[model samples]
Target chain A: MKTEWPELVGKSVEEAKKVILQDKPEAQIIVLPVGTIVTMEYRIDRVRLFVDKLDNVAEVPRVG
Target chain B: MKTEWPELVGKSVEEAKKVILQDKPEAQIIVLPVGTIVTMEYRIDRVRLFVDKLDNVAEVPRVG
Candidate 1:
């Protein structure tokens, strides 16, 4: 069973803010464990986000 | 207790491959749910990875 994950890449933290919320308004934002970077945890339902140190969008994962 | 998560961003799949496996050879790899993309799941124990469409290193999540 395949699931649909969030779509966010290259977009800045600010830009991703609106899009993420629009997709998963209840998504939990979190900062990826990296350098001096801070952002959302990035998760919708079971989906999750992986951001970079620059605070830019990276990848979204969803489990089915 | 703040658990240290995996550090991977801008790193290539091949590069992260070694590092991740070295860190936790038992890590599970899975493709992020998105466009034609297939990569590792990015996880060490409770840690997980969020890859991009291009199959590059994106986000790594770890729970505390």
Candidate 2:
């Protein structure tokens, strides 16, 4: 919950990509609705990106 | 797209949890519908788990 995420709170998708990919090249990135179901498989890369309607990062959670 | 994810392809939610948490204790875990929208804020912990209605892991993505 506490991380560099504060820097991306209001950043654009493209900008975020630079930071995310730089940290983990294998990260999974996607855009989705507010409520959606996912799986544990996401834990593989240890990272995933959620793009909101505004194209901004709305929430961040580390999947285990 | 490639990693140890093969091990969790059809795993149950609870079972997947053990594997995921074991890999990354700070991982984020959640259950929801498909086609959802997220944000770069998710990149914080570097991991997230998505559980489907079947109580199974449907999709796993590594957030930035």
Candidate 3:
């Protein structure tokens, strides 16, 4: 058995966003592991950061 | 100040695949976090739960 966290270890956050949006386009998605106090990038036209997953990650829509 | 949705609440949806594929390969990926969908898993795989970001979750070109 093996475990690999799906993370862009070396790539910048912006680079990761390009890859994520290119594949999945339904949700206004972003990535935030456990330890970090704020969400990394919300992938709207610009990037935003926050600490709450619901308040910051889910509740908001990045689309128009 | 809002809400969140992203997790496999139960064990089936062996129902999820059927719908997700139709809605979005882009959608084939599902993490239906509405309620008790399935149990849970720590990682991503054939048996584990769904993925977080679709961009990183691109189409797997099964090599022959």
Best by lDDT: 2
Better of 2 and 3 by TM-score: 2
Evaluation by lDDT, superior candidate among 1 and 2: 2
Ranking by TM-score: 2, 1, 3
Best by TM-score: 2
User: Backbone collision count in every prediction?
Assistant: 9, 32, 10
Interface CA RMSD, all predictions: 10.4, 7.9, 10.3
Candidate 2 segments whose C-alpha is farther than 4 A from its true place: A1-64, B1-4, B42-46, B61-64
Candidate 2 scores a C-alpha RMSD against the true structure in Å of 13.5
Q: Candidate 2, residue B48: CA error in Å?
A: 2.5
Residues A1-64 of candidate 1: C-alpha lDDT, one tens digit per residue: 3344456666666776566566665443443423323234542233334567776766653421
Candidate 2's residue-wise lDDT over A1-64, tens digit each?
3223445543466887777777657766565444456664635455444544345554552323
Could you arrange the candidates by lDDT from highest to lowest?
2, 1, 3
For all candidates in order, the CA lDDT equals 0.48, 0.52, 0.31
Best by DockQ: 2
Task: Quote model 3's TM-score.
Answer: 0.23
TM-score of each: 0.34, 0.41, 0.23
Q: In angstroms, give how far residue A1 of model 2 lies from its true place.
A: 19
True contacts kept of each: 0.00, 0.25, 0.10
- Tens-digit lDDT track of model 3 for A1-56: 11121444444445545654665444333343323333232322322211133332
